[PDB]
From TrEMBL, chains A, B:
Protein known as: Peptide deformylase
Gene (name only): def
Example GO biological process: translation
Organism classification: Bacteria, Pseudomonadati, Pseudomonadota, Gammaproteobacteria, Lysobacterales
Full-protein interval shown: 42 to 211 of 212
Keyword hit for Oxidoreductase: no
Keywords associated with the record: Hydrolase, Iron, Metal-binding, Protein biosynthesis
Length: 170, 170
C-alpha cells in the first residue's frame, strides 16, 4: 500500500524517532514493504519512516537505475532499522540532494565521503557496511530524517538551492 | 503587461543589479507599470526587478489588503529605484516571509524592526522614509533581491521553513 509522503513544514518530520523494537514482526515487514512501494512509486532513492508519518528509526533505500540521478551507481535495495553512522575519514564531498518531502527542489550538500553504518535488517539480523559517495550520502540523508533534520539546514552555498527544472549550477 | 516571475534556482536572481539611470523615462514608467501589474496578478506585497529578469535596482511594493498576509497593516503603493537601507536600531524581529520566486514556501526570518530607506521615485524625485515592522521587512526583503540574496540564506530556525499549506509553527 502506497503511503502519503508528508511534506516539509510538517511537524512530524521534526521529531527524533524512537528505536524499532519489533524486528522479525509481521507488522514491521508490512511497514517496510509499504516503504519500498512508496519509494518506488515516487522514484526515490531512499525513504525514511518519518516521511510517511511513522515515528520509527527505519529507512529504505537502493536502486539499480534512477530516473532522478540518473547516472548515480547502483545501490543495493536495503531496509535498515536503528541506523547508526560513523565517518571513516574527514573528507567531505558536495553532491545534489533532493527530498520527496520537498518536491521540485534540490541543493548541493556536503556529506562525509566515507562512512560505516550499522543497524538491523527487518528480520533482526545485523547489518554493518562501509559505504562511500552516493551510497554514503543517501544513508546520511535518510538518517538526518530520523533525528528531525532536513537538507536545507545543511546548505552552505545558497546559490545552489533552487527548483530542479530551473537550476543550472555545476 | 504581466511578466513571468522567474523562480529560485535561476542564476539571474543571483546577480548584483546595476543602478537605474533612466529616471523620468517613458521606458522606466512602462517597466514599473508592468511591475505593479505582475505583483498584483500574483498577489505579492513586493516585487524586485530581477524577479522578472530585469537586472536593475528597482522594486515595487505596497497594498491596502493582502490575501497572503492577510492582516498585515496597509503599506503605501511605492516604486523605488536605487534603494539604500540603514537600520535605525539593533532590534531584530521574526516574521513570516515568502517569495513568488519560491512558490508554496515560507519561513520565519529575522529583519531589523526599524529602518530608513532612500532612493528615487520613477519620475526622479527623491524618496526617503523611515519604516518599521512589516513595511520595513518588505523593503529589506526586496532589497536582498537587488544584491542577489534570497530568504533561505537568512533562515536561523529551520523548523519554521516549509510549504505554506503544511506549516503550523507560531
Amino acid at each position: 500500500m502506497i503511503r502519503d509522503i508528508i511534506r516539509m513544514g510538517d511537524k512530524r518530520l521534526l521529531r527524533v524517532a524512537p528505536q524499532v523494537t519489533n524486528l522479525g514482526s509481521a507488522e514491521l515487514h508490512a511497514l517496510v514493504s509499504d516503504m519500498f512501494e512508496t519509494m518506488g512509486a515516487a522514484h526515490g532513492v531512499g525513504l525514511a519512516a518519518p516521511q510517511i508519518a511513522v515515528d520509527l528509526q527505519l529507512m529504505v533505500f537502493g536502486f539499480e537505475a534512477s530516473e532522478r540521478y540518473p547516472e548515480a551507481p547502483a545501490v543495493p535495495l536495503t531496509a535498515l532499522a536503528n541506523a547508526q553512522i560513523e565517518p571513516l575519514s574527514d573528507e567531505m564531498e558536495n553532491g545534489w540532494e533532493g527530498c520527496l518531502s520537498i518536491p521540485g527542489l534540490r541543493a548541493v550538500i556536503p556529506r562525509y565521503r566515507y562512512i560505516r553504518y550499522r543497524g538491523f535488517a527487518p528480520d533482526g539480523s545485523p547489518i554493518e557496511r562501509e559505504a562511500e559517495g552516493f551510497h554514503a550520502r543517501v544513508v546520511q540523508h535518510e538518517y538526518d530524517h530520523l533525528v528531525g533534520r532536513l537538507y536545507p539546514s545543511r546548505i552552505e552555498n545558497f546559490d545552489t538551492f533552487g527548483f530542479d527544472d530551473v537550476l543550472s549550477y555545476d
